[PDB]
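Technical annex B. To support the medicinal chemistry partners, we prepared a structural model of the target in complex with zinc ion, based solely on the information shown next.
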Amino acid sequence: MIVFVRFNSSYGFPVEVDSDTSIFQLKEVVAKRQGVPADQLRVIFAGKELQNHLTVQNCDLEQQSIVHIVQRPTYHSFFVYCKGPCHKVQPGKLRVQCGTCRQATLTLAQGPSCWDDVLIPNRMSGECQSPDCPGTRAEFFFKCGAHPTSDKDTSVALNLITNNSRSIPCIACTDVRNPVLVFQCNHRHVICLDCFHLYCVTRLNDRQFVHDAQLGYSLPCVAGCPNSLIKELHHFRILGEEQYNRYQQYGAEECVLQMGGVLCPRPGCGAGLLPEQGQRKVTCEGGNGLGCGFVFCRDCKEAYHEGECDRVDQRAAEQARWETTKPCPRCNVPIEKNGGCMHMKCPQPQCKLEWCWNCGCEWNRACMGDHWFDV
Ligand SMILES: [Zn+2]
Ligand SMILES: [Zn+2]
Ligand SMILES: [Zn+2]
Ligand SMILES: [Zn+2]
Ligand SMILES: [Zn+2]
Ligand SMILES: [Zn+2]
Ligand SMILES: [Zn+2]
Ligand SMILES: [Zn+2]
């Protein structure tokens, strides 16, 4: 049988296999081809990572399919993308400052309780304590929590990523992982970060991103729900630098195709070619840059020749759906929570304990940063 191999591409190169073919041997063609050990390698298909031991005869793979290869005590409400030194998603620390003097001296009567309170500007107000400062506006920002950071060293919040405190199973793999990305669709479907990586990467390869006419290219819920397009495109940074970069070039790749052009299939080049005629024979001349001089067939994208050329389970998706009082730990007097805010103030004048809903401890700066609120 013939198998189509896609790794960091839109197209697949054909590999001769059969029913008796094992998986490990196939990643090894790629492993030497890419100098990357198969052991830190995965290949998923139609929503399934078929184990080393499964073969084509023990799965739904049929002749001429195409597959994808990738290379592989503290409550955290917030996750950021850290532009460095981390260059990855990390747990974050919430912070607030005076909208006027930009100092960390702004006191809030009530703390924030939802994402809107901290992403929507001018949403909350307080009093600044800084000497001779009348500033009232609350400016929220996030910082990477994986190392010390200057207060000017901010990071974008990945606001669809949630602490998996409810222990909801992943929509695609059915495992309980932490943290998870929860879509803004109707049923609010939950997906773990690994399956979200595989989802985006697969969609990249198949050129299946949705063009939101208003703002850029995105993806919706993996179940295909309506009104679920990701609006905070920084979420795609979970792809990691190379793939995210490839994601940013999506629009530029779209223009290349619409200009009737074809892309050089060589991964070290990947130039956008706009040849004059539509002849099957194509030579890479680099477009505006320098070409690799590859001559290929425009149809199969193989070296130029003379002849011819050669997902989500309902049960899992029902499971993976995201959706009043405690007694004061010091004085044991019941009190009701103000939505998502974790900052609890007991009204009993004798007790007057400020405490964290989640931790049950005295209120403190660590609890503000880690989980001032939760969803
Ligand atoms: Zn960091
Ligand atoms: Zn101020
Ligand atoms: Zn998963
Ligand atoms: Zn959904
Ligand atoms: Zn080229
Ligand atoms: Zn051909
Ligand atoms: Zn109390
Ligand atoms: Zn806490």
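Notes passed to the chemistry partners:
The two ends are 49 Å apart (CA to CA).
Residues 193-205 form the longest helix (13 residues).
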